[PDB]
Structures are given as structure tokens and as C-alpha cells.
Amino acid sequence: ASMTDQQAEARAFLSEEMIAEFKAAFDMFDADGGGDISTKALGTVMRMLGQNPTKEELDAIIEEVDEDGSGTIDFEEFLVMMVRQMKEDA
Ligand SMILES: [Ca+2]
């Protein structure tokens, strides 16, 4: 369907074993079973994994993860949110 370049580096930094764990949390917010969660529910995904950045970097993260602008986050865009702050500029 689609293939953003940001997803090429995201899965490149995440090991197959890591991406597997991130999937466990995906189904958590994916109560619909469609494979898409609300960017507003992401704030909850943070405290779940382990992150407490400034509310600012949060909003920017949403507009930086939706490279398509569909209005929803997908497992593919998830791996990006992880490498988003894990590899912002370091
Ligand atoms: Ca999207």
C-alpha cells in the first residue's frame, strides 16, 4: 500500500526482536482490530513503554509520525515514534 522512507530507517535501527515487543503494545491500543490507533491515545502509550518528554515534543511527534496525514497511526508509523525520540539528534 505505502512505504515511507522514515519506516526504512526505523526498522533498520530496531532489531526483529524489538519490533516484536512493540507489537504487543500495538494490539493493546488496537481494540478495534483494524490496525490503527488515535494519535491522542499515544500519550497513553508513552507512560506504558517508558517516556516522559515535554508535552511539546508530543504534538510535534504526531505531526512528525503522520507522514501521510491520514489522521491515524499505524503499526508501521509506530516503529517511527520509537526511533523518533530514541534517535532525534544523537
Ligand atoms: Ca497515518
Condensed summary:
The chain has helices at 5-13, 16-29, 39-49, 55-65, 75-86, and strands at residues 36-37, 73-74.
General description of the model:
With 90 residues, this protein is mainly α. The chain has one domain (1-90): EF-hand (Recoverin, domain 1). Strands 1-2 form a two-stranded antiparallel sheet. The protein contains 5 helices and 2 strands; from the N terminus they run ααβααβα. The chain has helices at 5-13, 16-29, 39-49, 55-65, 75-86; strands at residues 36-37, 73-74. The chain binds calcium ion. Calcium ion is lined by residues 66, 68, 70, 72-74, 77.
Bin the strand percentage: under 5%
Q: Strand-and-helix sequence, N→C?
A: HHEHHEH
Shape: globular
Bound molecules: calcium ion
CATH superfamily: EF-hand
Radius of gyration: 12 Å
Domain EF-hand: 17-52, 53-88
GO molecular function, one term: calcium ion binding
Binding site for Ca(2+) 2: 66, 68, 70, 72, 77
Family: Belongs to the troponin C family.
Notable characteristics:
monomer, 90 residues, mainly alpha, Recoverin, domain 1, two-stranded antiparallel sheet, 63% helix, binds calcium ion
